């Protein structure tokens, strides 16, 4: 199936407390493989998956230099953005960046991303054509015009459609068994009565990978949102994920409700019922 490589960068100003915190992580699909944390000891890019450890010193030296240049760039950005919005030195502010590429089942380029957020809101993003920019506000327009003048999109595009895809392919093959796997959800159901005339049905999905899944409750064959509670998909800690979907049902009609599970590890979507 499809695969992705994604890098996530977070830079946080620390008013009256020195240099910004900078954390960078790399993912292939839902598997992290590298990290840099400004508050860690090595001050280097560090391996986080067995399959990346084999890369030689040339690799690590390079990623280390690049991740520092990324750090340095956002250190300046925090100041630039504070000026753009005429903000005081009193407050802490956050710059976030994400970029990377998707490939299809044929491991050929599908899509590229390159997006910035300031204080948790969209600031600027490369559009899907990888040739133009979406700026969130008037301040962001200044960045847009500067990036148009420097022909940034053209250079990003070459990386996203070419180099980024090259890395993803190389990572996927070195990853081999773990990376390319899909683990179907191990399901089960719970049932604790709440009130005299009501009861809770919780549909469980465990040990699945990748993280992408869909749990849905149906009543007499039709969906239900709004009495259904969905917790956010969560890491189990062993490379698998977990999720659940609950619904409160009239005490006595438990058999009229069905949980529907959709995951790419499942040949066909599952329909479950309490019994």
């Amino acid at each position: 199936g499809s695969h992705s490589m994604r890098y996530f960068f977070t830079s946080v100003s620390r008013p009256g407390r020195g240099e910004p915190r900078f954390i960078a992580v790399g993912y292939v699909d839902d598997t992290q493989f590298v990290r840099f944390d400004s508050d860690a000891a090595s001050q280097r890019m560090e391996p986080r998956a067995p399959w990346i450890e084999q890369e030689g010193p040339e690799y690590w030296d390079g990623e280390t230099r690049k991740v520092k240049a990324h750090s340095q760039t956002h250190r300046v950005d925090l100041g630039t953005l504070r000026g753009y919005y005429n903000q005081s030195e009193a407050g802490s502010h956050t710059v976030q960046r994400m970029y990377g590429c998707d490939v299809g089942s044929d491991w050929r380029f599908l899509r590229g991303y390159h997006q910035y957020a300031y204080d948790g809101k969209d600031y600027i993003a490369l559009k899907e054509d990888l040739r133009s920019w979406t700026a969130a506000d008037m301040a962001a327009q200044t960045t847009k015009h500067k990036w148009e003048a420097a022909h940034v999109a053209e250079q990003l595009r070459a990386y996203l459609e070419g180099t980024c895809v090259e890395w993803l392919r190389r990572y996927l093959e070195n990853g081999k068994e773990t990376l390319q796997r899909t683990d179907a959800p191990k399901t089960h159901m719970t049932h604790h009565a709440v009130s005299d005339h009501e009861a809770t049905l919780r549909c469980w999905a465990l040990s699945f990978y990748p993280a992408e899944i869909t749990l849905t409750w149906q009543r007499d064959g039709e969906d239900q949102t709004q009495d259904t509670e969905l917790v956010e998909t969560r890491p189990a800690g062993d490379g698998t994920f977990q999720k659940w979907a609950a619904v409160v049902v009239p005490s006595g009609q438990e058999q009229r409700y069905t949980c529907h599970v959709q995951h790419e590890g499942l040949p066909k979507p599952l329909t479950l019922r309490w019994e």
Partner: peptide
């Protein structure tokens, strides 16, 4: 692998 060039906002 990371991009080799960043651009200031």
């Amino acid at each position: 692998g990371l991009m080799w060039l960043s651009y200031f906002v």
